[PDB]
């Protein structure tokens, strides 16, 4: 709302409604961190990136070309629909209850409603993220590892809430 | 005050001439397998010194940059002679770093005089006093020595208490910088990773300090402990 | 010693034996290897083939294999050094040496038992006599003879150059055996065209060797064929062509061919902003629409193409490009496969000197060697695409050098240097590609500059090679006059400078005029070179 | 016969068996088998090829050394070799296995993608220590009487009740104020009196005021099966005890013949025919255990003199010097004091041939010793303080504390990094008193299955090598040589002993007969 | 943009120093009055306001003249520009317009090439 996040403002940085915000599985609040070595590495990366425009567009190790990753995403989407395993679902259930209690107590301690609500759609969002992680591997079932990674990604969004 | 500028001009002539002379000589020395081999070694040595005219310029310009607040002509001399060397400013090799890894054992007690004083083990010029290192490590109240046996045992004891501190160190989350409360979690209450409060490279550097000390002064028992502690490593 | 008859004293000897091929990394070497492989596979000769990219890896391979093999064949390597001293062989091995490099080392020539040179005696050879080189007033005359030996042997070893193609030598062997297939004749053609493309021989010698190959082409074209009985489209047909000097012009647009050919790019000065209008004037003089010229050649309208070669020659003559034609050859097979010998040369060369970091140089050798067989036409077409990329990178690098004025006249010789991190320097880090770059850049420079003095100088070019060891690759090139005989002195000038300065020079490439040098020593090395050439 | 014919049939045999010989290998074979007749050559070759196949071959191509070793397996040491019957294994030498939860089995460190242990541990290793302790206890507990209902069990079958374990993450929410729930977790204080329970899923505060303790030494960082209910953000304990133990026979019945203990054998030592037949003739072996061996003062050398006098009859197979060799660890004096006293010990034991040539003199330093401090597993002291002993007493070793002895048919753990009084002085509610103290201590150490069941600041350990301090599967003898009074006891058919502080305890060393599976409760005040 | 102003087909450190100057001067201009002077000396002392470098070419000229006099006693512009290309100080026209050689009594001529 104020351009930069302006960390003292807190919930006043957001003019979005809870209705629209609850429909987002993940809300990455992105802050430009001024660290000196980060800035030096970032500047050298940008300068090299601008310098390298004439290098005949050579292939690269350890990554997928965009044209190939596009086809791979299409293939996985049409082929694989995973589900949660039972123990994975138990893990997700208990972690969700813990996160809900934490969000309630944070709002109570603040005596004000947070702009980001933690709802059953966020539970299903964690489920969807775990299934996407499994679909990358074409596995019919999502494991506790997938649920843990999904919860790790979601706890950035929960950091963004609390 | 003003004579700083006059000597800066005199140096603008003389420093240029001297750097040309040593450059042409040292790069013409055919015995140099590598110009990094040209440099001397002392128990405080750690830098990968490579091209003696550059180190010469760096050291001279450091003392010039600190013996007066008027750094403008010194920075101009840097920009002149680094370009004479054809080494770029703002590169890391153009930055000064202390060639000596100073390490002090504080409050060393002497029985000759009942006095206590601080002692640096890396600073001294070991080549000129290798037999007389312990007389060189005199108590400043007198000229009586501190002995290799006691200092070697002290260094081993320091290694043990330091390694105990490393083992029992705290862990801090990188995102919120609080301390880890209990043992079983792998991540913080947030999604952040934990990190060492006593980083391993600090101990590798201090172990290297102790190793160079022990190699220059022949401390074989300390070298046994150091070699085991170095062998059980990544 | 020189092998008088390849059939009797070389092939019929190694036919009964296990043999080890050391093959150098160049297209002529690859073609000779293909021909010799075909002969050995006909006769069930159990050979082993090892690629070698330099002297040190040749020594390593010989150390690995010397216990198990008694007969060795070196293709485009060995003739210009003392192989006995380099390899330190056992007393009863045999080294057959089929190599284009000249002058042949005198120890190789006058070794009569172990080194056997598969070299035509009618090549450009002037060996000093044995008594001039090999063994008070008596010892005074001994010292005088030794001084005369030093004089004569310097005069012999001064100028390095290239002789008859090894692929042509192996094809003559195949012809004498009467096992010369049409693909073997094509490989011989490709070897000679490799020599011509890389400017290792004079135009007179190239025309003479083309005249030799024309008769073999006619013989193969009348083995089972005449004006009224004709073969399937499956069979290969080699045809003599008085074709255009443009590079790859049947596989991309005529515009790209004119832009990326060294001769026309140099003449029209297309590195400069103004040169594109010169090229447009040339095309307008021809009367070719620019849309057709920029379209791919196979998709160009056929009414423009059936007199295009003579149209190009006619317009080039009045533009001052008096030799746009070249005597060459083409191969057809199937319905759609058609290649000029230059096209196959550039494709195989690019597959060798590819900029890809995956695999290794020996893997790229393997790709290039596979691409010369018609079972790997996909590899050949991939090589053609890589050749288009290589030619474009060559022109961009030439433009960068000339626009930034990196080419500076260092008195006796022009000097240029590529810089680490600049575009395509990794592509040109390899010595063969660097030699081609330096030759093309020298032609471009000679066409660019207006000074009469600069048009006659040779050129020395440096490029980064190593950072783990901090070295550069340095190449020396002779002047680019049409009167030139394609001989250069830089192979000996480099080592004279290196010993005068005690520089850390390493000498791994098979050509003496290419060296590796520590990046610190290049200053004093260049100072010695100016002092030496004077 | 022709050597080419011998070569042809040797190659044919290996090739039909699917194997390729190197040139040097077939050359060795075709000269080694020149004595063989045509009447037996194929039998000889099949014998050799089976011997070759016994090794862990990485390729179908066979090297010279493999054929050589196969012919040696066919001709020499085929029945036994002398050194298998006794070996000494340092803590840093112990192999590492990781328990895969989704395969429910132990995998080697070479098979998992886990990083290799190093002394300067990473932040992950410090967590993995306690997580792995929990993991071992968790998998062990779930296979005891607390196992599945089963889900087939019906009601008339499974008419009786059975425990079901819960994790801390499950008891929050609708599970509040249930009548009976039991949780495995570590017991620890946030502050004095603020007790909590912790597992890899979470942490919860304890109201243990009403807890019926099951008679053990429940310290900080012990793992317990707390039974109670959750309410008002507190777990209210009804009962409180250790997880049940497991014998090594049950452990092997589940996990196979895997060599958890150590040594060169792929299987455990007691599960191979060579050792199983050697133990029939190894009847007369005997070990001696001795702690507070303060040889830096010559009074202890006088004690060693009378020890050699007493036990020259029936020479011991080995002596166990339980560290803390310094009665005067003041400073630099102690180093040369220990060197001189070890020289003296070597000089006196050179006076006999039989003990000198048979008995293994093995040293395991502890805190009051030179070199590395009270950081576990204790590395051996400096080699310059051992070389002179070794060069004239080759039947001796200087190694870690704890240390593992594999006998021909038994397995023993030696440890002296003192903790009995530490266990007593930080019990949650109280210790359990009187002569029962050692029994409660061994119950604690066995149920916890780790030589240090107490916090790191109370007993420091190198993080990545914490697996070396494990007491799972249970050893056959557990020697905990604390400064505490000597004792003997047994639990889950494991013998457990303290040889004690010999100078204080009326000179009470102890001596163990592994072949007889028994020990002497000696007192050498009367020598 | 500065390279395009000079019609260069390739960008050079002249252009980079121009861009650096523009950025630093504008950022300094954004500051308050008291803060502006401290910022000026900060970025001027530490970072690159590369106005000119005449002293290197001055003493290169003096060295070459001293060596030539020593050689002759017991084309100098070509010698000077050769050294000026060897060292990364290629902008020699600035030195030829500056006073530092002029009060030391040197001079130049593109035809005679004597200095």
Q: B16: which chain E residues are within 8 Å (Cβ-Cβ)?
A: 55-56, 59
Return the closest-CA partner of residue A107 out of A22, A10, A9: A10
What phi and psi values does residue D495 have, to the nearest 5 degrees? -85, 140
Name the minimum distance, in Å, from the CA of C444 to any CA of chain A: 21
Q: B76: which chain E residues are within 8 Å (Cβ-Cβ)?
A: 55
Q: How far apart are CA D92 and CA D119, in angstroms?
A: 10
Question: Would you call D375 and B163 a contact, using CB atoms and an 8 Å cutoff?
Answer: yes
Between C and E, how many residue pairs show a Cβ–Cβ distance under 8 A?
7
Q: Could you tell me which chain B residue has the CA closest to the CA of A152?
A: B191
Q: Could you tell me which chain C residue has the CA closest to the CA of A52?
A: C423
Question: Would you call C408 and E10 a contact, using CB atoms and an 8 Å cutoff?
Answer: no
Q: How far apart are CA E92 and CA D167, in angstroms?
A: 79
Q: B84: which chain E residues are within 8 Å (Cβ-Cβ)?
A: 56, 87
Return the closest-CA partner of residue D315 out of D345, D365, D341, D349: D349
Question: Would you call D169 and A101 a contact, using CB atoms and an 8 Å cutoff?
Answer: no
Name the minimum distance, in Å, from the CA of B160 to any CA of chain D: 6
Q: Which of residues 80-109 of A touch D (CB under 8 A)?
A: 91, 94-95, 97-98, 101
SS3 C116: strand
The binding site of B consists of: 110, 113, 139, 142, 173, 176, 188, 190
Question: Would you call D169 and A94 a contact, using CB atoms and an 8 Å cutoff?
Answer: yes
Answer whether C518 touches B (CB < 8 Å): no
Q: B200: which chain D residues are within 8 Å (Cβ-Cβ)?
A: 120
Q: Which of residues 125-144 of B touch A (CB under 8 A)?
A: none
Question: Would you call B16 and E53 a contact, using CB atoms and an 8 Å cutoff?
Answer: no
Which contacts (CB < 8 Å, 24+ apart) does range D57-62 have? Answer: D60/D18, D60/D19, D60/D20, D61/D19, D61/D20, D61/D21, D61/D22, D62/D14, D62/D19, D62/D20, D62/D21, D62/D22, D62/D25
Neighbouring chains to A with at least 3 Cβ pairs closer than 8 Å? B, C, D
Q: How far apart are CA D221 and CA D455, in angstroms?
A: 6
Neighbouring chains to B with at least 3 Cβ pairs closer than 8 Å? A, C, D, E
Q: D126: which chain B residues are within 8 Å (Cβ-Cβ)?
A: 171, 183
Q: Do chains E and A touch (3 or more CB pairs under 8 A)?
A: no
Q: C421: which chain A residues are within 8 Å (Cβ-Cβ)?
A: 51
In contact, D87 and D406? CB cutoff 8 Å: yes
Q: How far apart are CA D475 and CA D406, in angstroms?
A: 10
- Show the tokens assigned to C502: 């005690």
Q: C404: which chain E residues are within 8 Å (Cβ-Cβ)?
A: 10
DSSP annotation of A43 reads: H
Residues of E contacting chain C (CB within 8 angstroms): 9-10, 85
DSSP secondary structure letters along D412-464: EEEE-S--HHHHHHT-SS----GGGHHHHHHHHHHHHTBS--S-TTTS-B-ST
DSSP annotation of B137 reads: S
> C194 vs A69, C370, D131, CA distance in Å?
41, 17, 68
**In units of Å, what resolution does this entry have?**
2.8
Q: B187: which chain A residues are within 8 Å (Cβ-Cβ)?
A: 152
Give the number of other Cβ atoms within 10 Å of residue D331's Cβ. Answer: 12
Pairing of strands C71-75, C101-102: unpaired
Q: How far apart are CA C407 and CA C401, in angstroms?
A: 7
- Show the tokens assigned to D98: 């990781």
Q: Which of C273, C400, C408 sits opposite E10 (nearest CB)?
A: C400
Return the closest-CA partner of residue A89 out of A141, A133, A51: A141
Q: How far apart are CA D361 and CA D88, in angstroms?
A: 11
Residues in Cβ contact with C187 at an 8 Å cutoff, skipping those fewer than 6 apart:
C31, C32, C34, C35, C167, C171, C372
Return the closest-CA partner of residue C366 out of C72, C30, C36: C30
The binding site of B for [4Fe-4S] cluster consists of: 173, 176, 188, 190
Number of H helices, E strands in chain C: 22, 16
Question: Would you call A98 and D170 a contact, using CB atoms and an 8 Å cutoff?
Answer: no
- Give ∠ CA B140-B141-B146 in degrees, rounded to 5: 55
Q: Considering Cα of C48, then C54, then C60, then C62, what sign does the dihedral take?
A: positive
- Show the tokens assigned to E2: 């500065």
Q: Could you tell me which chain D residue has the CA closest to the CA of A100?
A: D173
SS3 B198: coil
Q: How far apart are CA C377 and CA A29, in angstroms?
A: 54
D227: which strand partners? Answer: D182, D239
Q: At what angle do helices B200-217 and B148-167 cross, to 10 degrees?
A: 170
Q: Could you tell me which chain A residue has the CA closest to the CA of D169?
A: A94
User: Helices (DSSP H) in D217-332: which residue ranges?
Assistant: 248-255, 273-281, 298-311
Q: D151: which chain A residues are within 8 Å (Cβ-Cβ)?
A: none
In residues, how long is chain D?
527
Q: C400: which chain E residues are within 8 Å (Cβ-Cβ)?
A: 10
DSSP annotation of C10 reads: I
| CA atoms within a 13 Å half-sphere pointing along the CA-CB vector of D34 | 8
Q: Which of B12, B79, B84 sits opposite E87 (nearest CB)?
A: B84
Question: Would you call B229 and D119 a contact, using CB atoms and an 8 Å cutoff?
Answer: yes
DSSP annotation of D402 reads: S
In contact, E56 and B78? CB cutoff 8 Å: no
In contact, B163 and D375? CB cutoff 8 Å: yes
Best C354, C357, C385, C390 residue to mutate vs chain A (most A CBs within 10 Å): C357
Q: C524: which chain B residues are within 8 Å (Cβ-Cβ)?
A: 27-28
Q: Do chains E and D touch (3 or more CB pairs under 8 A)?
A: no
User: Helices (DSSP H) in C158-181: which residue ranges?
Assistant: 166-177
Q: Do chains C and A touch (3 or more CB pairs under 8 A)?
A: yes
Return the closest-CA partner of residue C447 out of C340, C358, C321: C321
Q: Which helix or strand (DSSP H or E) is residue D182 part of? A: strand D181-191
Answer whether B201 touches D (CB < 8 Å): no
Q: How far apart are CA B161 and CA D374, in angstroms?
A: 10
The binding site of B for Zn(2+) consists of: 110, 113, 139, 142
Q: Which of residues 30-59 of E touch B (CB under 8 A)?
A: 45, 48, 50, 53, 55-56, 59
Q: Which of E9, E10, E85 sits opposite C408 (nearest CB)?
A: E85
Q: How far apart are CA B218 and CA B149, in angstroms?
A: 11
In contact, C71 and C93? CB cutoff 8 Å: yes
Name the minimum distance, in Å, from the CA of A58 to any CA of chain C: 8
Q: B71: which chain E residues are within 8 Å (Cβ-Cβ)?
A: 45
DSSP annotation of D115 reads: P
Q: Which of B27, B30, B35 sits opposite C502 (nearest CB)?
A: B30
In contact, E104 and E54? CB cutoff 8 Å: no
DSSP secondary structure letters along C380-419: HHHHHHHHHHHHHHHHHHHHHHHHHT--EEETTEEEEE--
Q: How far apart are CA D396 and CA D402, in angstroms?
A: 17
Return the closest-CA partner of residue D194 out of A99, B181, C405: B181
- Show the tokens assigned to D303: 């004690």
Q: How far apart are CA D421 and CA D435, in angstroms?
A: 14
Q: What is the rounded end-to-end Cα distance, in angstroms, of chain B?
A: 55
Q: D372: which chain B residues are within 8 Å (Cβ-Cβ)?
A: 160, 163, 225
Q: How far apart are CA D54 and CA D63, in angstroms?
A: 14
In contact, D500 and D270? CB cutoff 8 Å: no
Answer whether B167 touches D (CB < 8 Å): yes
SS3 C135: coil
Q: Which residue has the tokens 């003041």?
A: D330
Q: What is the Rg, in whole angstroms, of the alpha carbon atoms belonging to chain D?
A: 28
Which contacts (CB < 8 Å, 24+ apart) does range C58-65 have? Answer: C58/C22, C58/C86, C58/C87, C59/C86, C59/C87, C61/C22, C62/C22, C62/C87, C62/C89, C65/C20
Answer whether C502 touches B (CB < 8 Å): yes
Strands (E) located in D234-347: 234-240, 287-291, 318-322
In contact, B185 and D126? CB cutoff 8 Å: no
> A108 vs A15, A102, A119, D89, CA distance in Å?
21, 10, 16, 59
What phi and psi values does residue C461 have, to the nearest 5 degrees? -125, 140
Question: Would you call C502 and B27 a contact, using CB atoms and an 8 Å cutoff?
Answer: no
Name the minimum distance, in Å, from the CA of B184 to any CA of chain A: 16
Residues in Cβ contact with D449 at an 8 Å cutoff, skipping those fewer than 6 apart:
D136, D137, D140, D470, D471, D472, D474
């Amino acid at each position: 709302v104020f351009g930069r996040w302006d960390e003292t403002k807190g919930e006043d940085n957001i003019d979005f409604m809870p209705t629209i915000l609850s429909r987002f599985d993940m809300i990455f609040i992105v802050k430009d961190e001024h660290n000196e070595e980060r800035d030096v590495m970032l500047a050298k990366h940008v300068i090299t990136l601008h310098v390298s425009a004439l290098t005949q567009t050579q292939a690269v190790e350890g990554e997928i070309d965009l044209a190939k990753l596009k086809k791979f995403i299409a293939y996985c989407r049409v082929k694989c629909g995973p589900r949660l395993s039972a123990e994975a679902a138990e893990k997700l259930k208990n972690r969700y209850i813990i996160m809900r209690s934490g969000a309630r107590q944070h709002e109570r301690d603040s005596d004000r409603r947070s702009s980001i609500p933690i709802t059953v759609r966020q539970l299903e969002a964690i489920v969807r993220i775990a299934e996407a992680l499994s679909k990358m591997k074409l596995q019919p079932f999502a494991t506790e590892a997938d649920v843990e990674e999904a919860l790790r990604l979601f706890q950035v969004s929960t950091l963004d809430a609390a | 005050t003003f004579s700083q500028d006059y000597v800066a001009n005199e140096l603008t002539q003389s420093f240029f001439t001297i750097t040309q002379k040593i450059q042409k000589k040292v790069t013409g020395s055919r015995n140099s397998t590598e110009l990094s081999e040209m440099f001397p070694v002392l128990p405080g040595s750690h830098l990968l010194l490579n091209n003696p005219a550059l180190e010469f310029i760096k050291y001279v310009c450091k003392v010039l940059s600190l013996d007066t607040n008027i750094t403008n002509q010194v920075n101009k001399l840097n920009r002149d002679l680094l370009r004479l060397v054809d080494v770029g400013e703002f590169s890391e090799e153009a930055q000064f770093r202390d060639p000596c890894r100073s390490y002090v054992l504080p409050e060393v007690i002497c029985r000759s005089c009942n006095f206590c004083r601080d002692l640096d083990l890396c600073k001294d010029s070991s080549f000129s006093e290798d037999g007389a290192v312990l007389p060189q490590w005199l108590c400043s109240n007198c000229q009586a020595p501190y002995d290799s046996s006691a200092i070697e045992m002290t260094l081993v004891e320091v290694l043990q208490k330091k390694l105990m501190a490393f083992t029992l160190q705290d862990l801090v989350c990188l995102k919120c910088r609080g301390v880890k409360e209990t043992s079983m979690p792998v991540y913080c209450s947030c999604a952040g990773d934990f990190a060492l409060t006593i980083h391993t490279q600090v101990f590798m550097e201090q172990i290297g300090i102790f190793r160079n000390i022990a190699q220059h002064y022949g401390m074989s028992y300390l070298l046994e402990t150091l070699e085991w502690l170095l062998q059980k490593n990544p | 010693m020189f092998v008088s008859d390849f059939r009797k004293e070389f092939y019929e000897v190694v036919q009964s034996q296990r043999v080890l091929l050391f093959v150098a990394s160049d297209v002529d070497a690859l073609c000779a290897c293909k021909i010799l492989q075909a002969l050995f596979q006909c006769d069930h000769v159990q050979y082993t083939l090892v690629p070698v990219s330099g002297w040190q890896e040749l020594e390593t391979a010989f150390l690995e294999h010397k216990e198990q093999f008694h007969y060795f064949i070196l293709i485009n390597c060995g003739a210009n050094v003392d192989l006995l001293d380099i390899l330190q062989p056992d007393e009863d091995t045999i080294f057959f040496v089929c190599d284009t490099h000249r002058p042949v080392n005198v120890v190789n020539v006058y070794n009569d038992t172990q080194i056997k040179l598969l070299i035509k005696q009618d090549d450009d050879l002037e060996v000093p006599a044995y008594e001039d080189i090999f063994r008070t007033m008596r010892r005074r005359q001994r010292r005088e003879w030794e001084a005369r030996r030093r004089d004569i042997l310097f005069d012999y070893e001064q100028y390095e150059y290239h002789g008859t193609s090894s692929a042509m030598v192996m094809f003559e062997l195949a012809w004498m055996l009467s096992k010369d297939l049409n693909d073997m004749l094509w490989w011989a053609i490709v070897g000679l065209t490799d020599q011509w493309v890389q400017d290792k021989i004079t135009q007179m010698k190239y025309v003479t060797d083309v005249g030799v190959l024309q008769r073999h082409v006619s013989r193969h074209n009348h083995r089972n064929e005449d004006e009224e009985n004709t073969l399937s489209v499956d069979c290969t047909r080699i045809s003599f062509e008085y074709d255009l000097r443009l590079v790859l012009y049947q596989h991309w647009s005529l515009h790209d061919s004119l832009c990326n050919t060294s001769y026309t790019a140099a003449r029209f000065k297309l590195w400069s902003v103004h040169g594109q209008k010169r090229l447009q004037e040339f095309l307008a003089d021809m009367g070719l629409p620019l849309k057709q010229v920029k379209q791919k050649f196979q998709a160009m309208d056929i009414s423009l193409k059936e007199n295009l070669r003579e149209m190009i020659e006619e317009s080039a003559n009045k533009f001052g490009m008096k030799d746009m034609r070249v005597q060459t050859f083409s191969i057809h097979f199937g319905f759609k496969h058609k290649f000029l010998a230059s096209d196959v040369v550039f494709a195989t060369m690019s597959l060798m000197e590819s900029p890809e970091k995956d695999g290794s140089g020996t893997d790229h050798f393997i790709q290039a060697l596979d691409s010369l067989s018609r079972s790997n036409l996909d590899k050949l077409y991939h090589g053609l695409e890589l050749a288009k990329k290589q030619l474009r990178a060559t022109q961009q690098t030439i433009a960068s050098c000339l626009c930034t004025n990196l080419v500076i006249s260092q008195g006796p010789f022009l000097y240029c240097s590529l810089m680490e991190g600049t575009p395509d320097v990794m592509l040109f880090s390899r010595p063969a590609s660097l030699s081609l770059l330096s030759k093309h850049l020298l032609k471009s420079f000679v066409c660019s500059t207006k000074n009469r003095r600069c048009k006659l100088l040779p050129l020395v070019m440096a490029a980064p090679l190593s950072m783990e060891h901090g070295t550069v690759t340095v190449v020396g090139i002779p002047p680019e006059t049409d009167s030139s005989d394609r001989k250069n002195f830089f192979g000996r000038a480099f080592e004279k400078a290196a010993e005068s300065t005690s520089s850390r020079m390493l000498h791994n490439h098979f050509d003496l005029s290419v060296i590796e040098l520590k990046a610190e020593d290049r200053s004093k090395f260049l100072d010695a070179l100016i002092s030496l050439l004077s | 016969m022709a050597p080419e014919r011998l070569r042809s049939r040797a190659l044919s045999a290996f090739k039909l068996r699917g194997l390729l010989l190197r040139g040097e290998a077939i050359k060795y074979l075709t000269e080694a088998l020149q004595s063989i007749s045509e009447l037996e050559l194929e039998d000889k070759l099949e014998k050799i090829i089976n011997a070759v196949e016994k090794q862990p071959l990485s390729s179908n191509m066979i090297e010279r050394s493999v054929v050589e070793a196969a012919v040696q397996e066919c001709s020499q040491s085929v029945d036994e070799t002398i050194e298998h019957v006794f070996n000494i294994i340092g803590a840093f030498d112990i192999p590492r296995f990781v328990y895969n939860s989704e395969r429910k089995k132990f995998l080697p460190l070479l098979m998992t993608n886990h990083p290799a242990p190093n002394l300067f541990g990473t932040p992950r290793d410090k967590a993995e220590m306690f997580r792995e302790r929990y993991t071992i206890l968790h998998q062990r507990t779930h296979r005891h009487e607390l196992f599945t209902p089963p889900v087939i069990g019906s009601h008339p079958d499974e008419s009786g009740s059975k425990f079901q374990l819960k994790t801390i993450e499950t008891l929050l929410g609708s599970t509040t104020k249930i009548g009976d729930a039991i949780v495995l977790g570590m017991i620890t204080q946030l502050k004095e009196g603020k007790f909590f329970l912790e597992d890899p899923t979470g942490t919860v505060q304890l109201d243990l005021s009403k807890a019926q303790f099951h008679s053990g030494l429940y310290t900080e960082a012990c793992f317990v099966l707390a039974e109670g209910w959750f309410e008002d953000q507190v777990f209210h304990v009804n009962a409180f005890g250790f997880p049940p133990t497991e014998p090594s026979s049950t452990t092997r019945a589940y996990y196979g013949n895997i060599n958890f203990f150590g040594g060169p054998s792929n299987t455990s030592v007691k599960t191979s025919a060579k050792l199983k037949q050697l133990e029939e003739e190894n009847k007369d072996a005997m070990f001696v255990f001795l702690s507070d061996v303060w040889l830096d003062q010559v009074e202890v050398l006088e004690k060693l003199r009378i020890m050699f006098a007493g036990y020259s009859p029936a020479p011991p197979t080995c002596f166990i010097l339980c560290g803390n060799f310094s009665s005067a660890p003041y400073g630099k004096n102690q180093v040369q004091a220990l060197k001189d006293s070890l020289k003296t010990l070597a000089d006196i034991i050179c006076e006999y041939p039989d003990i000198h040539q048979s008995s293994r003199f093995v040293f395991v330093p502890g805190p009051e010793d030179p070199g590395f401090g009270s950081i576990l597993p204790r590395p051996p002291l400096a080699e310059s303080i051992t070389n002179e002993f070794r060069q004239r007493v080759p039947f001796s070793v200087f190694t870690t504390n704890p240390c593992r002895i594999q006998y021909c048919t038994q397995e023993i753990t030696v440890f002296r990094e003192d903790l009995v009084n530490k266990m007593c002085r930080n019990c949650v509610r109280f210790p359990s008193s009187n002569l029962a103290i050692p029994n409660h201590f061994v119950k604690t150490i066995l149920s916890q299955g780790h030589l240090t069941p107490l916090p790191l600041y109370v007993c420091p350990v190198y993080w990545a090598y914490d697996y070396a301090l494990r007491v799972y599967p249970v050893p056959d003898l557990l020697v905990i040589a604390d400064k505490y009074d000597p004792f003997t006891t047994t639990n889950t058919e494991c013998l457990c002993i303290n040889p004690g502080s010999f100078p204080r305890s009326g000179f009470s060393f102890k001596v163990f007969y592994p072949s007889n599976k028994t020990v002497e409760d000696s007192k050498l005040q009367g020598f | 943009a500065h390279a395009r102003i000079h019609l260069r087909d390739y960008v050079i450190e002249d252009d980079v120093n121009m861009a650096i100057r523009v950025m630093l001067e504008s950022f300094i201009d954004t500051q308050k009055f008291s803060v502006m002077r401290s910022m000026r000396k900060t970025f001027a002392r530490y970072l690159s306001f590369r106005r000119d470098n005449n002293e290197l070419l001055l003493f290169i000229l003096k060295q070459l003249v001293a060596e030539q006099v020593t050689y002759q006693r017991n084309v100098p512009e070509k010698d000077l520009v050769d050294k000026a290309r060897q060292i990364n100080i290629h902008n020699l026209s600035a030195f030829y317009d500056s006073e530092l050689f002029r009060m030391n009594k040197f001079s130049h001529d593109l035809k005679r090439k004597m200095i």
